[PDB]
Amino acid sequence: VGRLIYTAGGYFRQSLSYLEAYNPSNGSWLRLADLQVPRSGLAGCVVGGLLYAVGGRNNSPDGNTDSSALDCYNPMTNQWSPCASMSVPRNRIGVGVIDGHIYAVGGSHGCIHHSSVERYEPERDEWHLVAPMLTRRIGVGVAVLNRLLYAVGGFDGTNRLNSAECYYPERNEWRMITPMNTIRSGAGVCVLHNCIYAAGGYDGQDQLNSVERYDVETETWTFVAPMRHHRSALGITVHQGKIYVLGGYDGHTFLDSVECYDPDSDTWSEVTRMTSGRSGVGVAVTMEPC
Ligand SMILES: NS(=O)(=O)c1ccccc1
Numbered sequence: 001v002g003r004l005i006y007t008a009g010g011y012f013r014q015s016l017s018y019l020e021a022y023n024p025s026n027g028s029w030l031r032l033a034d035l036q037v038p039r040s041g042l043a044g045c046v047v048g049g050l051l052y053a054v055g056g057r058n059n060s061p062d063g064n065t066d067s068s069a070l071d072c073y074n075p076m077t078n079q080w081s082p083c084a085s086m087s088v089p090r091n092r093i094g095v096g097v098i099d100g101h102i103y104a105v106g107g108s109h110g111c112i113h114h115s116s117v118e119r120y121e122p123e124r125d126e127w128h129l130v131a132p133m134l135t136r137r138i139g140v141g142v143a144v145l146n147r148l149l150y151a152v153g154g155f156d157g158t159n160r161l162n163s164a165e166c167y168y169p170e171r172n173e174w175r176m177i178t179p180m181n182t183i184r185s186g187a188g189v190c191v192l193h194n195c196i197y198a199a200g201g202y203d204g205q206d207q208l209n210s211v212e213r214y215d216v217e218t219e220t221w222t223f224v225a226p227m228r229h230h231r232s233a234l235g236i237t238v239h240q241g242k243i244y245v246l247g248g249y250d251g252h253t254f255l256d257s258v259e260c261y262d263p264d265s266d267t268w269s270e271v272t273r274m275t276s277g278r279s280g281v282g283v284a285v286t287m288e289p290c
Pocket residue numbers: 010011040041042092186233279280281
């Protein structure tokens with residue numbers, strides 16, 4: 001964990017440059033340095049206390065550009081720094097961190113829906129491709145549990161997916177896992193205790209409030225309590241043993257709602273609102289800035 005939940009970028013009318021940090025200990029929001037380039041459909045992660053913004057797309061008045069960018073935010077300095085770019089642009093990307101390395105998974109580049117996966121090494125500032133997924137996935141949820149990488153749901157270019165797969169680093173190999181009970185593109189995916197959670201998303205007809213979790217020991221998905229708001233393209237993270245979901249789109253509104261899940265009581269509650277409604281944000285947790 002750390003201290004603050006950082007939300008970077010997103011979409012409302014066009015792609016956003018916002019970086020804002022929510023503090024669960026006092027309810028406060030802080031606006032921090034803007035991204036250098038607006039982006040929606042990006043992912044956030046943390047390595048060595050630095051916040052990384054990965055991929056996305058700049059949907060803007062003057063044009064639409066898919067992003068291969070990796071950028072690094074240092075809370076100590078309140079400055080963004082560019083890192084090496086990925087091999088390819090990846091809008092509606094998923095990311096996971098294992099052993100201080102960032103895995104970028106799937107996403108789109110125009111009509112190209114990627115199965116490709118690449119890994120960034122911060123000590124070298126270098127990306128390298130690894131084995132591709134067995135399925136093309138954009139709007140894909142990614143999480144890490146016990147140093148294995150999970151890619152969950154998404155859209156393959158033709159169908160929204162209930163399927164999911166796992167990457168075994170030491171074998172450089174992807175294998176299918178049990179599919180979810182619900183088709184979901186754009187779900188929030190995270191890890192808590194021994195389970196991979198998939199919250200919300202879009203099933204082809206409707207934005208979802210349902211939430212299900214995969215127990216790696218049993219290989220089964222089980223529904224838990226649904227969110228209070230239906231939402232796709234939500235941000236998600238974990239902070240002190242609770243899941244937080246941030247924004248997204250419900251078919252009517254770009255949500256400012258932030259919900260918090262308590263796994264012991266199996267209940268969701270609203271904890272704050274974002275300063276403005278948005279979908280397609282990048283979210284991660286690190287130390288408070290100066
Ligand atoms: N990342 S976003 O702009 O919220 C988006 C979400 C779903 C489909 C297309 C775009």
